From a paper:
GNA1 catalyzes the acetylation of glucosamine-6-phosphate (GlcN6P) to generate N-acetylglucosamine-6-phosphate (GlcNAc6P), which is needed for the biosynthesis of UDP-GlcNAc, a required precursor for both GPI-anchors and N-glycans. Apicomplexan parasites have a hexosamine pathway comparable to other eukaryotic organisms, with the exception of the glucosamine-phosphate N-acetyltransferase (GNA1) enzymatic step that has an independent evolutionary origin and significant differences from nonapicomplexan GNA1s. To further characterize the enzyme and, given our inability to express and purify sufficient amounts of active PfGNA1 (10), we used CpGNA1 as a surrogate, considering that it belongs to the same Apicomplexa-specific GNA1 family and can be purified fairly well with a high yield. CpGNA1 is found as a dimer, as is the case for other reported GNA1 crystal structures. CpGNA1 adopts the typical GCN5-related N-acetyltransferase (GNAT) fold previously described in GNA1 enzymes, though with some variations (see below).
The dimeric structure of CpGNA1 in complex with acetyl-CoA and glucose-6-phosphate (Glc6P) from data at 1.95 Å in space group P212121 was solved by molecular replacement with Phaser using the monomeric structure, and further assessing ligand binding by representing unbiased sim-omit maps. Note that Glc6P was used previously as a pseudosubstrate to get insights into GNA1-GlcN6P recognition and catalysis. The CpGNA1 structure consists of a central twisted four-stranded antiparallel β-sheet surrounded by four α helices. Remarkably, the highly conserved tyrosine of the active site, also present in CpGNA1 (Tyr127), establishes a hydrogen bond between its hydroxyl group and the thioester sulfur, leading to an increase in the electrophilic character of the carbonyl group of the acetyl-CoA molecule during catalysis. Note the proximity of the Glc6P OH2 that mimics the amine group of GlcN6P to the carbonyl group of acetyl-CoA (distance of 3.45 Å), which clearly supports that the same mechanism might take place for CpGNA1. There are 19 residues of CpGNA1 engaged in the recognition of acetyl-CoA and Glc6P. The adenine moiety and the dimethyl group of acetyl-CoA establish CH-π and CH-CH interactions with Ile122 and Ala123/Leu126, respectively. The phosphorylated ribose, pyrophosphate, pantothenic acid, the β-mercaptoethylamine, and the acetyl moieties are tethered via hydrogen bonds to the Arg95 side chain and Lys125 backbone, Asn90/Arg91/Gly92/Gly94/Arg95 backbones, Ile84 backbone, Val82 backbone, and His81/Val82 backbones, respectively. The Glc6P is tethered via hydrogen bonds to the His81/Thr117/Arg27 backbones and Arg73B/His81/Arg113B/Thr117 side chains.
Numbering used by the authors:
A (entry chain B), B (entry chain A): 2 to 144
Amino acid sequence: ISSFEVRKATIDDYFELRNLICDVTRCTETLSREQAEERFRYNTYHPYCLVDTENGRIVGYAGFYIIPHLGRKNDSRIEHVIISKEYRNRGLGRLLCKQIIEDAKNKFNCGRIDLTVESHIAKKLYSSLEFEKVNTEVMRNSF
Amino acid sequence: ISSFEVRKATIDDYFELRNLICDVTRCTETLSREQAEERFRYNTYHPYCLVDTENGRIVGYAGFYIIPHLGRKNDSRIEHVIISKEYRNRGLGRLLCKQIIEDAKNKFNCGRIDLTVESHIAKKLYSSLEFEKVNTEVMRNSF
Ligand SMILES: CC(=O)SCCNC(=O)CCNC(=O)[C@H](O)C(C)(C)COP(=O)(O)OP(=O)(O)OC[C@H]1O[C@@H](n2cnc3c(N)ncnc32)[C@H](O)[C@@H]1OP(=O)(O)O
Ligand SMILES: CC(=O)SCCNC(=O)CCNC(=O)[C@H](O)C(C)(C)COP(=O)(O)OP(=O)(O)OC[C@H]1O[C@@H](n2cnc3c(N)ncnc32)[C@H](O)[C@@H]1OP(=O)(O)O
Ligand SMILES: O=P(O)(O)OC[C@H]1O[C@H](O)[C@H](O)[C@@H](O)[C@@H]1O
């Protein structure tokens, strides 16, 4: 009977969000308030977090990004969806993304959502939400 | 001996860019002045065009997008790279990307640049610019 709420992440959650991402992810930097303010005020970046209502704690995070397109509805992407190791395999990853996916379709009027999966849990998550194989090749230049 | 210049695309170029972008890509819409103005004011979206200095025409386009990150240098992506059928295989595809790639590294302090490619010409261009194949799986939810 544990309550949860999906909500937009904020600057006041920076360090708790950073502890969640950097517990599972490749982190290299701790932002100042001026840098953090900059990244949160990029108007294409929509950080979602998932909160436990019982203890006010953030337990999930997902980064949603608008990719503007000229001549079509904007594209978008989901990167860095993370659920607290404690809370996994309970439907909160699905709960979080479904809120994202509906905001993309009808709140931001996007034409599509793109993502890279590389996981095993992840691929079975997004297939279950109508993400289908895209027949491209990803390439990366790392600095 | 034709001179060219890379510059940031602007609203005043909307219809000339749309004619260029929509020939190889899947366009569905032509934006109003308010929608177009809105998309040009997304502060992660850096539309690059390449102009023929001789005849003021836009002959190339590439979309550069910042992907904000918490705890790391920002990511970025290159989408919609096209050179006019007339101007190809002359080094203008490389010229455009190298300006972007240098602005990503040292103007926006990105950690990496991501992209998806499909045609042969394209993949050989970015491999020659230190893009390496990632071997992930791209998925899409299309609305
Ligand atoms: C940036 C990228 O490339 S995408 C991936 C980014 N982030 C990560 O992988 C972080 C590490 N992993 C996690 O945090 C979580 O496991 C996530 C985010 C992948 C999924 O979050 P969860 O809360 O565990 O997922 P949830 O409980 O909603 O289940 C999602 C679907 O995936 C499946 N699934 C979830 N966990 C597992 C598991 N351990 N084993 C097999 N299947 C699983 C489920 O079948 C589920 O569908 P179902 O409930 O109808 O059966
Ligand atoms: C992220 C994305 O946008 S991917 C989608 C790619 N965009 C498109 O396909 C739109 C249609 N095609 C084009 O607009 C252009 O052909 C581009 C953008 C792919 C390349 O632009 P160009 O101006 O022709 O490239 P440029 O003259 O700089 O040479 C690019 C490299 O690609 C290769 N290349 C170029 N043309 C060819 C060709 N006809 N056949 C084989 N290789 C070629 C070469 O290796 C060349 O390197 P080099 O000059 O050292 O020999
Ligand atoms: O899905 P489309 O809009 O038709 O795009 C086709 C796509 O081909 C490649 O993957 C490029 O990286 C994209 O920038 C381009 O848009």
